[PDB]
């Protein structure tokens, strides 16, 4: 309360919010536990030359299939309005 004055102070519900520290709670540990089983760190990240290769080879493959995915998205959205979708009929 006191919003907009020199008496402004945090309301009660903000104080309660900051009283919830979630000490000793980890609801996302499953994600990291399962991610670690991919062994990406042991195989690629730990060694600098392999870390570079991951960025290069990943960027190569990632860039190609990223382009491929959105090209299909474009073709679906503009279905029936593309030059390839409407073969031209020559006048007689």
């Amino acid at each position: 309360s006191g919003f907009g004055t020199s008496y402004a102070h945090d309301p009660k519900w903000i104080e309660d919010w900051m009283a919830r520290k979630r000490v000793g709670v980890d609801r996302m540990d499953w994600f990291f536990r399962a991610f670690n089983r991919l062994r990406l760190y042991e195989l690629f990240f730990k060694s600098t030359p392999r870390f570079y290769a991951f960025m290069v080879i990943g960027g190569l493959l990632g860039s190609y299939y990223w382009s491929r995915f959105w090209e299909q998205y474009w073709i679906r959205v503009n279905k029936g309005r593309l030059y390839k979708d409407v073969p031209y009929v020559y006048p007689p």
Binding site: M18, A19, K21, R22, V23, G24, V25, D26, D29, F32, R33, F35, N36, L38, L40, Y41, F45
Partner: protein, 54 residues
Amino acid sequence: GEPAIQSIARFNPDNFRPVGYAENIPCPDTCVPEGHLDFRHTRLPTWHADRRPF
């Protein structure tokens, strides 16, 4: 009647403090007051999984 040496000694700037200095000036014991989040609240549980790979 005070010796001039004693009189001028009192008017050293270190002998003047504002009225109420000892009852007002804050004396912080920490830069993280009670109720504020710190490493003691964000430390993960000891059974957690490695966070380096991610």
